[PDB]
Amino acid sequence: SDPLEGFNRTMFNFNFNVVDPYVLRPVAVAWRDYVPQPARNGLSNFTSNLEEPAVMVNYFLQGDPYKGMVHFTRFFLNTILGMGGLIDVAGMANPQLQRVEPHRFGSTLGHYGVGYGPYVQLPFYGSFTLRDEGGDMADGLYPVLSWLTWPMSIGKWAVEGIETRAQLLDSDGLLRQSSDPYILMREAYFQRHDFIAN
Amino acid sequence: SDPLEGFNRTMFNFNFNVVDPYVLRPVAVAWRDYVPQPARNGLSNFTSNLEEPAVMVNYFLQGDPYKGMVHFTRFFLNTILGMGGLIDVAGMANPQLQRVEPHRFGSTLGHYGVGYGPYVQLPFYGSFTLRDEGGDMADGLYPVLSWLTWPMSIGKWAVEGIETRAQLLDSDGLLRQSSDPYILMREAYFQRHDFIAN
Amino acid sequence: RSDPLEGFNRTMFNFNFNVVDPYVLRPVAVAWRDYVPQPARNGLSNFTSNLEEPAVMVNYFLQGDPYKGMVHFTRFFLNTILGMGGLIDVAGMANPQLQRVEPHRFGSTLGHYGVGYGPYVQLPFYGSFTLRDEGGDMADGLYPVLSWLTWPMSIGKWAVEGIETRAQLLDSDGLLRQSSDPYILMREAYFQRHDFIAN
Amino acid sequence: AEIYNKDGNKVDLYGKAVGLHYFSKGNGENSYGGNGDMTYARLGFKGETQINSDLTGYGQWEYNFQGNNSEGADAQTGNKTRLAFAGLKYADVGSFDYGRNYGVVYDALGYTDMLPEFGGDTAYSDDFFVGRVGGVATYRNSNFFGLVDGLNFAVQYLGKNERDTARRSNGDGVGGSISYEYEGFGIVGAYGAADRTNLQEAQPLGNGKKAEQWATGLKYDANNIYLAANYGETRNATPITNKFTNTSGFANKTQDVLLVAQYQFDFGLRPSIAYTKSKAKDVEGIGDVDLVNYFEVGATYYFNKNMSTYVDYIINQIDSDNKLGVGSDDTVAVGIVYQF
Amino acid sequence: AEIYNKDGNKVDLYGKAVGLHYFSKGNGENSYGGNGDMTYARLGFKGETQINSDLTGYGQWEYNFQGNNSEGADAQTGNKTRLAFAGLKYADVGSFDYGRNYGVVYDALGYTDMLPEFGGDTAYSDDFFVGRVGGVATYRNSNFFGLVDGLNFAVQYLGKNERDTARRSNGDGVGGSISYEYEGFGIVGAYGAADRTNLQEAQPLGNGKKAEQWATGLKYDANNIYLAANYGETRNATPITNKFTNTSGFANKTQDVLLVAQYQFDFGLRPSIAYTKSKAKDVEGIGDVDLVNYFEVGATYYFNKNMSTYVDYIINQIDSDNKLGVGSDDTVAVGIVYQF
Amino acid sequence: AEIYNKDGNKVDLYGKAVGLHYFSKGNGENSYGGNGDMTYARLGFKGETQINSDLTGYGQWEYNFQGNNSEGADAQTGNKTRLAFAGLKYADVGSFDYGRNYGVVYDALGYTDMLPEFGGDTAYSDDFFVGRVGGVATYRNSNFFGLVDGLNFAVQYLGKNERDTARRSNGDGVGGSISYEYEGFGIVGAYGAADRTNLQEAQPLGNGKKAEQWATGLKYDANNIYLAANYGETRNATPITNKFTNTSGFANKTQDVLLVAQYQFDFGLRPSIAYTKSKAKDVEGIGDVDLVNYFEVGATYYFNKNMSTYVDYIINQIDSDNKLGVGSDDTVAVGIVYQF
Ligand SMILES: N[C@H]1[C@H](OC[C@H]2O[C@H](OP(=O)(O)O)[C@H](N)[C@H](O)[C@@H]2O)O[C@H](CO[C@]2(C(=O)O)C[C@@H](O[C@]3(C(=O)O)C[C@@H](O)[C@@H](O)[C@@H]([C@H](O)CO)O3)[C@@H](O)[C@@H]([C@H](O)CO)O2)[C@@H](OP(=O)(O)O)[C@@H]1O
Ligand SMILES: CCCCCCCCOCCOCCOCCOCCO
Ligand SMILES: CCCCCCCCOCCOCCOCCOCCO
Ligand SMILES: [Ca+2]
Ligand SMILES: [Ca+2]
Ligand SMILES: [Ca+2]
Secondary structure (H helix, E strand, O other), X not given: OOOOHHHHHHHHHHHHOOOHHHHHHHHHHHHHHHOOHHHXXXXXXXXXXXXXXXXXXXHHHHXXXXXXXXXXXXXXXXXXXXXXXXXXXXXXXXXXXXXXXXXXXXXXXXXXXXXXXXXXXXXXXXXXXXXXXXXXXXXXXXXXXXXOOHHHHHHHHHHHHHHHHHHOOOOOHHHHOOOOHHHHHXXXXXXXXXXXXX | OOOOHHHHHHHHHHHHHHHHHHHHHHHXXXXXXXXXXXXXXXXXXXXXXXXXXXXXXXXXXXXXXXXXXXXHHHHHHHHHHOOOOOOOHHHHOOHHHOOOOOOOHHHHHHHOOOOOOOEEEEOOOEEEXXXXXXXXXXXXOOOOHHHOOHHHHHXXXXXXXXXXXXXXXXXXXXXXXXXXXXXXXXXXXHXXXXXXXX | OOOOOXXXXXXXXXXXXXXXXXXXXXXXXXXXXXXXXXXXXXXXXXXHHHHHHHHHHHHHHXXXXXXXXXXXXXXXXXXXXXXXXXXXXXXXXXXXXXXXXXXOOHHHHHHHOOOOOOOXXXXXXXXXXXXXXXXXXXXXXXXXXXXXXXXXXXXXXXXXXXXXXXXXXXXXXXXXHOOOOHHHHXXXXXHHHHHHOOO | OEEEEOOOEEEEEEEEEEXXXXXXXXXXXXXXXXXXXXXXXXXXXXXXXEOOOOXXXXXXXXXXXXXXXXXXXXXXXXXXXXXXXEEEEEOOOEEEEEEEEEOOOHHHHHHHOOOOOOOOOOOOOOOOOOOEEEEEEEEEEEOOOOOOOOEEEEEEEEOOEOOOOHHHOEOOEEEEEEEEEEOOEEEEEEEEEEEOOHHHHOOOEOOOOEEEEEEEEEEEEEOOEEEEEEEEEEEOOXXXXXXXXXXXEEOOEEEEEEEEEEEOOOOOEEEEEEEEEEEEEEEOOOEEEEEEEEEEEEEEEEEEOOEEEEEEEEEEOOOOOOOOOOOOEOEEEEEXXXXX | OEEEEOOOEEEEEEEEEEEEEEEEOOOOOOOOOOOEEOOEEXXXXXXXXXXXXXXXXXXXXXXEEEOOOOOOOOOOOOXXXXXXXXXXEEOOOEEEEEEEEEOOOHHHHHHHOOOOOOOOOOOOOOOOOOOEEEEEEEEEEEOOOOOOOOEEEEEEEEOOEOOOOHHHOEOOEEEEEEEEEEOOEEEEEEEEEEEOOHHHHOOOEOOOOEEEEEEEEXXXXXXXXXXXXXXXXXXXXXXXEEOOOOEXXXXXXXXXXEEEEEEOOOOOEEEEEEEEXXXXXXXXXXXXXXXXXXXXXEEEEEOOOOEEEEEEEEEXXXXXXXXXXXXXXXXXXXXXXXXX | OEEEEOOOEEEEEEEEEEEEEEEEOOOOOOEOXXXXXXXXXXXXXXXXXXXXXXXXXXXEEEEEEEOOOOOOOOOOOOOEEEEEEEEEEEOOOEEEEEEEEEOOOHHHHHHHOOOOOOOOOOOOOOOOOOOEEEEEEEEEEEOHHHOOOOEEEEEEEEOOEOOOOOOOOEOOEEXXXXXXXXXXXXXXXXXXXXXXXXXXXXXXXXOOOEEEEEEXXXXXXXXXXXXXXXXXXXXXXXXXXXXXXXXXXXXXXEEEEXXXXXXXXXXXXXXXXXXXEEEEEEEOOOXXXXXXXXXXXXXXXXXXXXXXXXXXXXXXOOOOOOOOOOOOEOEEEEEEEEEO
């Protein structure tokens, strides 16, 4: 149940349109255009490294130290050997060490069963819930994520986003060819964010 | 010719029948019972080592430098490498170096033809002749055997004796089932001490 | 071609061929092959041929085949340093393309740019001589190695090199006595070798 | 790497090239382990010749080349020979080897010497019986002459090395150790005592005729787990140094604890945590005083039997005002290790 | 010589024994290279472990034993560890190795470092980025992540080594190189910059906070011919020494040229000719001054891949009155070299 | 141990680990050979390349690591390079090798250098032509160019080493040796002479322009028996030292005798006996004086080609008041040796 749903639709029309066709989509063109693959997955190598301690922290917080100690190794091997996180040495090493989606403090809240309260949808941010977006901000209370300055964090948010936007530049049809484009967006946020807390 | 047979028999009756069954034989059981095997042959390893230089001396004195240099190697390897005599390395090394009976100055005396004088038979000692028992004590006039104290020597003598007695815990029948245990006894000393004299 | 001092050269060839060869050279060239051992003999011929090598290198460069010249440089390098001052032919035990050959000295370079021998002459005790080569060769005593030998040293080099070729030829004697004209055969063999060297 | 095996003689030639680097606050003068590049390399041979059915002959030599030096005046800094001995193994009645070899009390301290870069703080080199040492005859015997499986004993004589520095000297000494290992658990106990040289007597710190050190240990090595404890006492043996008066010598008594816990993951990472505290007693002019005190959290990652990479983080507890001047700062190390 | 290859790990153990001898005028104090016996030997291992399709691990250690020393007091003179590093080579995303290794500006200077005995005068050991040096992390990547064949880049961080001599010390630095090779030609460019240590500041010669070296090179290596030119400038890095005042330190600026032309004949001989001029600028109390200046003609003869022999003749152009005292006389070297 | 043999190059990498220990009265200061741990290890290669039918190329390097040092201040005491040379063997006309190698008058002294640990007293290292020495070009030839079997000569040039100590320095010298071996017998003769350096001229002991050493030797090596004699004289070469005045230098003349007799038993033991007397004549301010004088009895027992163990006992005849202070007490050694 979505209590603030009327606001979220007005801002989704803002995000899906006016701000997507006139700004985002041109930038996502020049990204896949002028940026080479070594740069992109090397940048995704380097941005994922910085969540590893927060993933390690929260896997311990959830109670599977095996998962957490794998991500300590990810960070360990990548930052030391693989060029400050740029090269994924903890991945070429063992099959069991491959990169996965982040489990941050939002998942730890959910693994202990916390309602999201309301779902909301903010201009320029997109999908947001009190529990996850925000509960995710809790990992800036301890190393790596606490080391980032306000200029640093907004760049990480922007470059990771451009990459996700450029990879999906052509699956647009699954959303253009659905009777209901918004509600699969709202439910695809709850698709991803509910498996992560399991 | 056994001139003191009347004394020597009176003393063999002394040894064979009062000091063997009531002292030695129980000691040799508790020896073979409670003392482990590595201990026992390690002690016979250690006491024969102390005669080895005296054997090497006398093989030279008799004119066999090969035997002497065989016995030098015995003492050398055993004391230096093989743990002060406890271990028989000059034996695990070459078959030509395996342990043999001691050749002391008693053997040298007879090897040039001297004679035992009379045979005698001492309580607690057993067989004794001037030439070998005693003539052997000349080898306590030069190193190794000169380094033993009178208590060391009576213990070496007693540790060796208890060991030879414990090996024979079942050959007793071979001596109870003979008409003259004494003449088998007296004849066994001249048996060994004349092979030793070659 | 034309032999202008032929009367002199023949008079001296009769000198060399019939009194200084049979009464001096030929006995000594015997005692050489008799009493000198083979390692000694080809060791000395190793060592005297060694000293011409830098001048051969100088002159192959002067003629324009740096490949040959560097081959003779190596001969000198490997032999002098490694192989014991020239006594041992290591630059030859090493590569076939490095084996000893006839010397090209300053007589050869002169001819390689085409200057006549002038007249042929035949000196007593020297034998064949032309201004261009015997003598024109002496210009290589104006610069390294050969410039280092004294008057006693160099005539000894000429003498040991000579006795060896004579002792190597101790049985080809018939091939020169049994020709109607030994002189024109020896003289034409001088222009034979010295013309091959200028190729 | 076994590079030779012909006619009953095998020659193992081994080595490693360890890229090491320490990080400490400042220039690391007051730190646990120092600051900067600590790269080194090792090279050794292990020899082994089958003489016949009973006798086997062995010999070992192991050396330490440093790679944090320049090629200049200091080129040999810290280059040293760690081991060099030869010996004989008799069928069942043990093994005897004389040379530069480990002291007998290392038989106990090895339990707690498992850390990626640090630890093993009480096993000082050239310090009688606890670390490597010269002129040591060692007799060892495993499984008690074939009679008791799991039971090993060792006994060793230490001949006097009268060197130039008292740090590196000893008189004549003797010592032994025993261990029983039974299904993954392990007990061990060792003791040595040795005459002190005249020059060790004349040191400002430490006073006494004989040095002695003993140590004990529990361990549990099984099912990818490692637990290990050591306790030990030394009299006049642990070398110490007063950084304030610039005197040195030996602590007159020390009481030492080491705990290790490491777990080996199947994917390659072997984290470890440890505790170490070496307390000195009755130090001249000081009294009780801490020589060592830390928690370590660290990890070795294993790529395979030839390559590894680790981080060793020391949380130092020695105080800012340690009266002996012991450094008080943290140190963290990172290593990459090729070995063959 | 690959002396082990078992379980995806090959261990090359290599070495050489070079019988060397220099010839220079007099006692050779005024020489380019000195006078007398120069015999030395080398010994090293290169390691290599196949972890899987992508990761391979390596390790190398190389030492230099001198044989022109006595067996007495001076035995270790000039003995040194030349290399000690470990690393990881990733499929296409490059290679990363930490230890004692070559500086990145050698990526250019090697081009003209081809002479039999001399040359490479600007590749000083323990001099920031132009030669071997302790504590360097090096990342290199060939054929640009598989995308551009012939194009290689490398980038390197220099950990500060604060040693006892200003000659051998450096602050923290970073640096890189790029090279393109296309059908026998080779162009290259390398540049490094680094903080100087405090002690390098207190030296009579040389003054400034940051030291930097850069060098470039054209080369043509094809058809048995070798041409190589290097040009390079250094600020605060080239060590110098005024033999008159017995002061030393660092040149304030240098401009470096190196030329090599060599040819390989099919019968075995490889002649070479070279020109080198390293001119120093802005020297205290001196001004401009030549550090290096020569024509070199030399030649190596190759018996096979295991035995060789060379002669290297330096025609020295340094003046009889080089204001810094650089020796001016000629030197020639002769070597025989067995290597395995 | 031949650890490589591929493409006409075989690489023998060998070494040993010798657990040694000496025994002498007191602290062994006044003794023949010392007291305490003497453990050492060696490590070397011999290389050998088949160039073709005639040419063989070789190179050898051999080092001595000590194991009786601590891992501290004295770690490299006594580490040295014993040999390092390269050379060429031509078909039938001999061998030429330049480097650090044995002097030519060792060709004679080798006859009597067979003892288990001692002996070989007159073959001083770094002493012109007897024992090892730096910067020597050596030509050797066996069986006289293939023409006379058993007859070998060698001739050697000594390149000048002007070092920091007079003891370890030499001028230029030439020297040669000849030996005939025929059916177990061996006759040998060696002689070399060389300029003394200016620094050797200035020593309180020893005076003269040129140094010369010669030695001759009889031997009989056949039937598990070894007999050997050496006689030799030196002028201005045998190093001496007066421990009373703390001066040093060279003996003006020495007259040297060396006799060896040993037998090898089929069961492994090789007992030996020796006698040595090096008498110095005309020592400055002293006169005649014995430098060496003893009978030796010893034994090596051979377990196989890889393990061995010996005892070497010196009966020292040097007097209590040997004016140079040469020590007079007896010394005995015990060794266990693994070699590969
Ligand atoms: N690459 C030129 C080099 O420059 C670099 C650094 O500039 C920046 O440092 P900043 O001062 O702004 O903090 C920046 N950090 C960057 O990372 C670079 O590392 O400079 C020289 C010449 O610069 C001079 C000048 O105008 O001549 C001289 C400098 O001084 C000298 C000196 O003795 O005073 C001489 C040099 O031999 C050397 O010792 C330098 C040391 O590096 C001192 O740090 O000092 C200095 O006064 C600078 C000022 O800092 C300018 O802001 O100016 C230049 O050489 P060129 O031959 O003259 O062209 C380099 O090309
Ligand atoms: C028969 C076919 C090949 C022709 C033989 C050529 C021989 C060239 O090599 C022989 C060189 O050996 C000479 C040895 O001389 C002694 C050198 O050493 C002397 C020591 O100073
Ligand atoms: C290869 C095994 C050898 C190991 C033996 C080491 C033994 C060290 O102890 C030395 C024994 O000598 C001690 C002498 O005590 C001092 C005597 O000083 C005066 C000498 O007369
Ligand atoms: Ca005390
Ligand atoms: Ca400057
Ligand atoms: Ca004199």
